[PDB]
């Protein structure tokens, strides 16, 4: 069913701003159409918002409906739009996060997005297409989330000996950390950036928590921000704990599990994004403090649904 022949929209706009019910699709969900469609709207300057979009909500609802009904491993899944409506796509290369981009086309279903459930770091995620790009709502309110969209996938190897661990090639770690340091320095009128392990609260935010094969690993990221790095350059192994019993990222309450088997339990993944936070208060100072925190899992879908925005189709649009 390849070929569309007529793939650009000319004339007065024909899409407003709303929000409806979009349904999952993969290969409950439906077969992803193997003939995706795209249409460019020339000389259309558009503006999107990644924090006030009524999508991350539906993603959270589908993820909860997914874990409730539940081998185990993330599945790349789309988000198709009902008839009469269309998803808009911001294809600009270096998108700040919000505001306007001037290269916008319209899909029908989004791209495959595997729902990763982790804090501090983002794994198994699409990389950006140019430089390290930062995203936040307010750059003054230090109690707001902070996303570092990287541009070099870094493999991680979390393994269980049949007190588990995670191996990471530390040289690329030091290099990507130097790059992130460069970009933060730029985004703060060239200030001295400094990092720190997370503060109080449950081990949910103090340790880097993630899911794997059914178990959950909480890692101590002590070394990953050893500022004497900026040894260090050799391959480095973070000891982590297979914490069976967690805090409910399932609504409200808790849950339980069963101890493991005498076999290798291993996840190799791609670190492709970072969740940080900020200190502040006493500033003053010639320094910028940063600890990883985030906490809220919605941020993850935020980080991966920035470019899409639902619109309602109707002719006669008015400028």
């Amino acid at each position, epitope marked *: 069913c390849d070929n569309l022949w*007529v793939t650009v929209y*000319y*004339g007065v706009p024909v899409w407003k701003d709303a929000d409806t019910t979009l349904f999952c699709a993969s290969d409950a969900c439906v077969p992803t159409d193997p003939c995706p469609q795209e249409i460019h709207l020339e000389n259309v300057t558009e503006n999107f918002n990644m924090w006030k979009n009524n999508m991350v909500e539906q993603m959270q609802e589908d993820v909860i409906s997914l874990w409730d009904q539940s081998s185990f491993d993330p599945i790349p899944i789309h988000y198709c739009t009902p008839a009469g409506y269309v998803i808009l796509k911001c294809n600009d290369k270096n998108f700040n996060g919000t505001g306007p981009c001037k290269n916008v086309s319209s899909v029908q279903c989004t791209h495959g997005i595997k729902p990763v459930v982790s804090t501090q770091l983002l794994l198994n995620g699409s990389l950006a297409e140019e430089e390290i790009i930062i995203r936040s709502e307010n750059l003054t309110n230090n109690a707001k989330t902070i996303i570092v969209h990287l541009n070099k996938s870094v493999e991680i190897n979390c393994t269980r000996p049949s007190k588990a661990y995670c191996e990471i090639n530390g040289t690329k770690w030091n290099k990507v950390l130097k790059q992130v340091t460069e970009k933060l320095k730029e985004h703060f009128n060239n200030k001295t950036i400094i990092f720190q392990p997370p503060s109080g609260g449950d081990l949910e935010i103090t340790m880097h928590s993630f899911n794997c094969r059914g178990e959950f690993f909480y890692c101590n990221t002590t070394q990953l921000f050893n500022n004497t790095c900026i040894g260090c350059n050799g391959t480095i192994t973070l000891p982590c704990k297979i914490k069976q019993i967690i805090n409910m990222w399932q609504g409200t309450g808790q849950a339980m599990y069963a101890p493991p088997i005498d076999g290798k339990i291993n996840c190799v993944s791609n670190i492709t994004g970072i969740l940080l936070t900020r200190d502040g208060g006493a500033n003053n100072t010639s320094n910028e403090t940063f600890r990883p925190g985030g906490g809220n899992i919605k941020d993850n879908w935020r980080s991966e649904l920035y470019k899409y925005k639902v619109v309602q*189709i109707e*002719p*006669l*649009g008015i400028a």
Partner: antibody, heavy 131, light 112 residues
């Protein structure tokens, strides 16, 4: 009536610009698509562009996209077509003609059949490009 | 795109006996609405084009009933019962499914 009257056209050196206009006079203008259709000397008819009754969904040809621009104001009851930048093969005899519609939902997002009845044609106006 | 063809690319006729020309697309024109998205126009020399048939078979006003449109899907046949010397023109075949497409023309003259 019922008529359309064209204005514009003449010697215009390549790289230049031009504007044609179609003056509508005798029908409910804000109720029909308007279409521009040319004709080279010696060659045959060639559709150029189409625009709807609400000035939406403009379909351009291949040799016309990015260059030409179709505007409209359903109050002055005129058409306007902005030709730029011009090549020597756009030398033609341009025509404006109204056309019924039937908007559709099956062409990805929206899409009407801008043009399916061209009963009332312009008088024709010539446009030459050389040196 | 959609390629359109006509035949015969020239057809001398006689002021009296009937005639018929044909148009074929490369894609069918139906739209699940029952009526075809194809028109039939005429160009008399010097003067601007007219319209003869719109949507498959339906005839525009002013046109005599001697102009019969036929066919559906991919094959279309404009048949004309009886003629005179007013039709010395060029008969064009237009598609209106996706965008707008014309034909190459079917020049018509007198038999001699």
């Amino acid at each position: 009536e019922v008529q359309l009257v064209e204005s514009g056209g003449g010697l215009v050196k390549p790289g230049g610009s031009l504007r044609l206009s179609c003056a509508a006079s005798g029908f409910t203008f804000s109720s029909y698509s308007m279409n521009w259709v040319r004709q080279a000397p010696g060659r045959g008819l060639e559709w150029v562009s189409s625009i709807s009754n609400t000035s939406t969904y403009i379909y351009y040809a291949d040799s016309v996209e990015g260059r030409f621009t179709l505007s409209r104001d359903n109050a002055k009851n005129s058409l306007y077509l902005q030709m730029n930048s011009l090549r020597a093969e756009d030398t033609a005899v341009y025509y404006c003609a109204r056309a019924n519609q039937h908007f559709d939902w099956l062409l990805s997002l929206l899409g009407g059949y801008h043009y399916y009845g061209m009963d009332v044609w312009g008088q024709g106006t010539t446009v030459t490009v050389s040196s | 795109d959609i390629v359109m063809t006509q035949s015969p690319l020239s057809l001398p006729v006689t002021p009296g006996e009937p005639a018929s020309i044909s148009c074929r697309s490369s894609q069918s024109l139906l739209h699940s609405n029952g009526y075809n998205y194809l028109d039939w126009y005429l160009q008399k020399p010097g003067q601007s084009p007219q319209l003869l048939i719109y949507l498959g078979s339906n005839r525009a006003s002013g046109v005599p009933d001697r102009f019969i449109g036929s066919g559906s899907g991919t094959d279309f046949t404009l048949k004309i019962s009886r003629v005179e010397a007013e039709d010395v023109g060029v008969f064009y075949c237009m598609q209106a499914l996706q965008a707008v497409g014309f034909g190459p023309g079917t020049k018509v003259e007198i038999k001699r």
